[PDB]
Amino acid sequence: LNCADPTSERWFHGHLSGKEAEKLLTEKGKHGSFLVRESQSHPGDFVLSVRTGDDKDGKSKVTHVMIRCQELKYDVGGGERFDSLTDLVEHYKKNPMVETLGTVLQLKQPLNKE
């Protein structure tokens, strides 16, 4: 409740498990495709799920990002802070998020809820 409400965004899926998200980003997503969903470990917190590979079963590889809301601002654990998730998303289309797990994390096309 303590940050700008992003629930009306089209790339916001609300309740969507990691397995469901992986299936979505696979069946319809490309490299760098992303969605936001609610955390299953931290109620009320958000997860940015990003497609980071084509291959690993016939499913694609997804890297997940914890979104932190603190003092009315969003960030992904450090660095830059945003008044909205929409601003955060735009910034990480233009900028790399992180290099981890043998993949360079950067956003491309949103995967919208249907």
């Binding site: 609610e38 299953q40 997940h64 797990l101």
Partner: protein, 93 residues
């Protein structure tokens, strides 16, 4: 009181971990294995789901000489959220 209990790396290659947790007395529907590089953890991770009938998993495609943090979650098909109190370990390489 963690669920599950006794998470450990059973065997490891430079690029892969073989993990195990307690097959318990009270069973759950599924497990979610999460893992990431320590220092970027807990903000970046990868994960996968296994049935509650399993108490072992392999995490592969890792890099040698890297510190990893691994957390296993337990869950119910009747809840969106995981059970509280997961178990977590560190392992390098």
């Amino acid at each position: 009181s963690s669920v599950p209990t006794k998470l450990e790396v059973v065997a490891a290659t430079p690029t892969s971990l073989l993990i195990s947790w307690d097959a318990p007395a009270v069973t759950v529907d599924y497990y979610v294995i999460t893992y990431g590089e320590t220092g970027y953890w807990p903000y970046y991770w990868q994960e996968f789901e296994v049935p509650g009938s399993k108490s072992t998993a392999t995490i592969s495609g890792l890099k040698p000489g890297v510190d990893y943090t691994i957390t296993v979650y337990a869950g119910s098909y009747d809840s969106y959220y995981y059970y509280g109190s997961p178990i977590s370990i560190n392992y390098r390489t």
